[PDB]
Design a protein around this ligand. Structure first.
Ligand SMILES: [Mg+2]
Ligand SMILES: [Mg+2]
Length: 506
C-alpha cells in the first residue's frame, strides 16, 4: 500500500516469452478438451472448472457450443448431482432449464427434499449452488436453498477429505454465483490442484494465464498510482488508500486484459467517488457542498476558487477526469461522452447532497426513500453508465439515455451494491428499516438479506429476457454486485498481495 511501491510496478514483468509460448500451446489443448468427447458429467465438471479458474473469457465460444450440444439423458436424469450441475451450467450460459427437473427428488406429499440425499456431499453442494440461479416464484429452488444450506451445515464437520471440507466451508460463506471471478480464480487454483480428478493441462494453463493477466494488472496499477500522486489527492486527509481499494473493486467488475483501458478509467472514477464521499460526509460545509454540486450541474468552474483547497482539488480532478473519459470516447468510440460523464456525476453529487442535508437537518428517511437516493450514492449508476459509454457498439444519445434512466436490470444491480454495502458496514439500510418498522436489529438485518436474495432473482431473470444490452455490459452489471459481496463479508491486503502482486510459482 505504498505509492512508491505501486508506481514502481509494471516496470518489471515476471512473465517470459517462453511462458507466453507455452500458454498458447496449452490453450489449444484445453480447447481440444472442451470440445473433445468426454463423459457428460465429466464435461460439465470440466467446463465448470474452466469458469472457476477464471478462464471463461478465453474459451467462451467452445464452452457454449459444448453446452449446447449437451443440451441422451441417461447420464443425468437418474442422479441429482448431475441434474443440479446440469441445471446450473445451462442456466449460467443462457439455456433455460425448468425447476421441475428437481421434482423427482422431492417427497410428493411434503414437497420437501428426501432426507435420503443428505448423506452425499457433492450432491448437496451442486444443489446448493444451483439454487442461486433461481427466479422469483420458483419455489422448488427456494426450497432447495434452505434444504441444502441446512444439510451442508450439518454435514460439514462430518467430512474427511480436507479439500472437500474447504470447498463446503467456502460455499457456505458465499455461493459461487455471488463470488467475484478474479478473486475466486486465485483461490480455486490451489483447490483444484488437490482434487483427485484434476486435469493437469487445465491447471497448468490456469496458472500461466493467471500470471500473464497479472502482469497486465501490474502495469495498470503503476499508471494509476502515478496518476493519483499526480492529482495530489494522495496527500489529502480523506480516503486513505482509496485508489488501491478502487482498483481492487474494478478487478471484480472486469479483469480481462483486453479491457485494460476501460478498467483503468473505472478505477479512476471509483477513486474519486470514494474521495468525494468523504468530502460530503465529513469535511465539507453545506454551503461548500451545495456549491460543489452546483458547479457540477452546470459543468461550469467559474466559482471554484470559492472553495477551500482540500475541496477544490477533488472537484477539479473529477471535472478533469470526466472530461478525459469523455474525450476517450470521442477519440476511440467516435462519440463525445462528456455530457454523460458530467450528468452521472451531477446526479451523484445531488444524491450526496441530499444525504448530507438530511444529516444536517435531522431527517430520518424511510427505507424506500433512503434506497431511492442510496442506489445512486453508492456510485454504481455512475460506474455502470460510464462503463456502457466506453464499450457499447455504435453509441448514441438514445442508448446512453436508456441506460441512464436506470432500467430494472441496472437498477437491481445498483440496489444490490448498496444493500450489500450497508450489510457489511449515519443512517443506512438497516436503521432506516428499524424505524419504518421499529423492528429489532437482528430482524431488520434478516429482512435486508431477503432483499439481496430477491434482487438477485430479478437479476437472474433479466438475463433471460429480451434486452438492448449485450456483452460486455451484461457482465459488468452482474460483476459489480459480486465485487460488492467480496469486499463486504486487512483481509483486503492479503487478497491484494495474492491476486495482484505475487505471481503463482511454477
Ligand atoms: Mg456517504
Ligand atoms: Mg475559469
Amino acid at each position: 500500500w505504498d505509492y512508491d511501491f505501486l508506481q514502481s510496478l509494471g516496470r518489471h514483468s515476471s512473465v517470459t516469452e517462453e511462458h507466453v509460448g507455452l500458454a498458447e500451446k496449452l490453450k489449444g489443448e484445453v480447447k481440444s478438451l472442451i470440445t473433445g468427447p468426454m463423459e457428460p458429467l465429466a464435461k460439465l465438471e470440466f467446463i465448470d472448472s474452466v469458469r472457476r479458474l477464471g478462464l471463461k473469457y478465453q474459451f467462451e465460444t467452445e464452452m457454449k457450443e459444448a453446452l449446447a450440444n449437451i443440451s441422451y439423458d441417461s447420464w443425468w436424469v437418474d442422479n441429482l448431482r448431475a441434474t443440479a450441475l446440469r441445471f446450473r451450467l445451462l442456466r449460467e450460459n443462457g439455456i433455460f432449464v425448468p425447476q421441475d427437473v428437481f421434482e423427482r427428488f422431492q417427497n410428493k406429499e411434503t414437497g420437501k427434499f428426501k432426507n435420503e440425499l443428505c448423506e452425499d456431499v457433492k450432491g448437496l453442494l451442486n444443489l446448493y449452488e444451483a439454487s442461486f440461479l433461481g427466479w422469483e416464484g420458483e419455489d422448488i429452488l427456494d426450497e432447495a436453498r434452505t434444504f441444502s444450506t441446512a444439510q451442508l451445515k450439518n454435514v460439514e464437520k462430518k467430512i474427511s477429505s480436507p479439500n472437500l471440507a474447504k470447498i463446503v466451508h467456502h460455499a457456505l460463506d458465499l455461493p459461487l454465483h455471488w463470488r467475484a471471478i478474479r478473486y475466486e480464480a486465485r483461490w480455486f487454483i490451489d483447490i483444484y490442484e488437490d482434487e483427485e480428478d484434476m486435469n493437469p493441462t487445465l491447471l497448468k494453463y490456469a496458472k500461466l494465464d493467471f500470471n500473464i493477466v497479472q502482469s497486465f494488472h501490474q502495469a495498470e496499477i503503476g499508471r494509476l498510482a502515478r496518476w493519483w500522486v499526480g492529482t495530489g489527492l494522495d496527500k489529502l486527509p480523506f480516503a486513505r488508500n482509496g485508489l488501491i481499494q478502487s482498483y481492487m473493486y474494478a478487478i471484480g467488475m472486469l479483469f480481462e486484459p483486453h479491457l485494460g483501458e476501460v478498467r483503468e478509467m473505472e478505477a479512476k472514477v471509483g477513486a474519486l467517488i470514494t474521495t468525494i464521499d468523504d468530502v460530503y460526509d465529513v469535511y465539507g460545509t453545506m454551503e461548500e457542498l451545495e456549491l460543489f454540486t452546483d458547479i457540477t450541474e452546470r459543468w461550469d468552474i467559474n466559482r471554484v476558487d470559492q472553495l477551500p483547497r482540500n475541496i477544490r482539488m477533488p472537484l477539479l480532478t473529477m471535472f478533469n477526469t470526466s472530461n478525459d473519459i469523455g474525450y476517450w470516447a470521442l477519440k476511440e468510440r467516435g462519440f463525445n461522452g462528456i455530457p454523460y460523464t458530467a450528468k452521472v456525476w451531477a446526479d451523484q453529487l445531488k444524491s450526496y447532497t441530499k444525504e448530507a442535508k438530511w444529516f444536517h437537518e435531522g431527517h430520518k428517511p424511510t427505507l424506500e426513500e433512503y434506497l431511492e437516493n442510496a442506489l445512486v450514492s453508492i456510485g454504481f449508476p455512475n460506474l455502470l453508465v460510464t462503463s456502457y459509454l466506453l464499450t457499447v457498439d455504435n453509441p448514441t444519445k438514445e442508448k446512453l439515455d436508456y441506460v441512464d434512466s436506470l432500467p430494472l436490470f441496472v437498477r437491481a444491480s445498483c440496489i444490490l451494491c448498496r444493500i450489500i454495502n450497508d450489510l457489511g458496514t449515519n443512517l443506512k439500510s438497516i436503521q432506516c428499516y428499524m424505524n419504518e418498522t421499529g423492528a429489532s436489529q437482528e430482524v431488520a438485518r434478516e429482512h435486508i438479506e431477503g432483499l439481496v436474495r430477491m434482487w438477485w432473482k430479478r437479476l437472474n431473470k433479466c438475463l433471460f429476457e429480451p434486452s438492448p444490452f449485450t456483452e460486455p455490459f451484461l457482465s459488468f452489471t452482474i460483476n459489480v454486485v459480486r465485487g460488492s459481496h467480496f469486499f463486504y463479508q486487512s483481509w483486503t491486503k492479503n487478497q491484494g498481495m495474492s491476486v495482484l502482486i505475487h505471481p503463482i510459482t511454477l
